[PDB]
C-alpha cells in the first residue's frame with residue numbers, strides 16, 4: 001500500500017548516522033535476504049557506509065552504499081548489486097527507528113522499510129512504530145519480520 005507522507009516532515013542532519021538493523025518490511029523481503037545491518041557515516045547532508053546481509057546464494061556479504069539526501073527523499077545506491085537502488089521517501093524518523101518507502105526493482109509496486117537501533121526492538125519501540133505507521137496510512141499487521149534473527153527463546 002502507498003503511504004500518505006507527512007506534509008512537513010523534516011529529515012534532520014546526521015539523523016541516520018550509525019548502526020541500524022532492518023528488521024521489518026512490507027512486503028516481506030526476508031525469504032530473499034536476512035540479517036540486514038546498516039552502518040552510515042555523515043558526509044555533509046549525505047551519507048556513505050556499509051550494508052551487510054545474509055544471502056541464500058552468497059552467505060554473509062558486504063556492500064558499500066551511498067545515501068544522497070534531498071529534503072524528505074534520498075537516493076539509495078549500492079556498489080555491486082542494484083535491486084534495491086531507488087528513491088526513497090522518509091515516512092517517520094525517531095531516535096530508535098526510521099521508516100522509508102520506495103519502489104526499487106526488487107519491489108516496484110512499493111517497499112516500506114523499518115530500520116531499528118536495536119537488533120530486537122523492545123515492545124515500547126514497536127508500539128511507537130505501529131502508531132507511526134498508522135499516521136502515514138500504513139498498518140503494521142501487513143509487515144513481515146526477519147524470523148532468522150533470534151529475538152525469543
Ligand SMILES: *[C@@H]1O[C@H](CO)[C@@H](O[C@@H]2O[C@H](CO)[C@@H](O[C@@H]3O[C@H](CO)[C@@H](O)[C@H](O)[C@@H]3O)[C@H](O)[C@H]2NC(C)=O)[C@H](O)[C@H]1NC(C)=O
Pocket residue numbers: 035037052053054060
Ligand atoms: C549477521 O550479521 C552480523 C553482522 O554483520 C554478523 O556478525 C559478524 O560476523 C562476521 C563474521 O563472523 C564478523 O567478522 C569478523 O570480524 C573480525 C573483526 O573485524 C575479523 O577479525 C574476522 O576475520 C571476521 O571478519 C563480524 O565481526 C561480526 N559482527 C558482529 C557485530 O558480531 C553475523 O555473522 C551474521 N549472522 C548470520 C547468521 O548471517
Ligand SMILES: *[C@@H]1O[C@H](CO)[C@@H](O[C@@H]2O[C@H](CO)[C@@H](O[C@@H]3O[C@H](CO)[C@@H](O)[C@H](O)[C@@H]3O)[C@H](O)[C@H]2NC(C)=O)[C@H](O)[C@H]1NC(C)=O
Pocket residue numbers: 061062063064079080
Ligand atoms: C562493494 O563493496 C564491498 C565492501 O566494501 C567490497 O568488498 C571488498 O572487496 C575487497 C576486494 O576488492 C576485499 O579485499 C579483500 O580483503 C581481504 C581481507 O578482508 C583479503 O583477503 C584480500 O586482500 C582481499 O583483497 C574486501 O575485504 C571487501 N570488503 C568487505 C567488507 O567485504 C566489494 O569489492 C565492492 N564491489 C565492487 C564491485 O565495487
Ligand SMILES: *[C@@H]1O[C@H](CO)[C@@H](O[C@@H]2O[C@H](CO)[C@@H](O)[C@H](O)[C@H]2NC(C)=O)[C@H](O)[C@H]1NC(C)=O
Pocket residue numbers: 123124126127141143144145
Ligand atoms: C513481528 O514481531 C513483533 C515483535 O515480536 C510482533 O509483535 C508481537 O507479537 C506477539 C505475538 O506474535 C505479541 O505477544 C506481542 O504483544 C507483539 N508486540 C507488539 C508490540 O505488538 C509481530 O506480531 C510480528 N509480526 C509478524 C507478522 O509475525
Ligand SMILES: CCCCCCCC/C=C\CCCCCCCC(=O)O
Pocket residue numbers: 022033036051053055076081082083084088113
Ligand atoms: C534502503 C534499502 C537498504 C536495504 C537493502 C537490503 C540489502 C539487501 C542487499 C542485497 C540483496 C541481494 C542483492 C540481489 C541478489 C542478486 C545478486 C547476484 O545475483 O549477484
Ligand SMILES: *[C@@H]1O[C@H](CO)[C@@H](O)[C@H](O)[C@H]1NC(C)=O
Pocket residue numbers: 043047048066
Ligand atoms: C559516494 O559516492 C561517490 C561517487 O559520486 C564516491 O566517490 C564516494 O566515495 C561515496 N561516499 C561519500 C561521498 O561519502
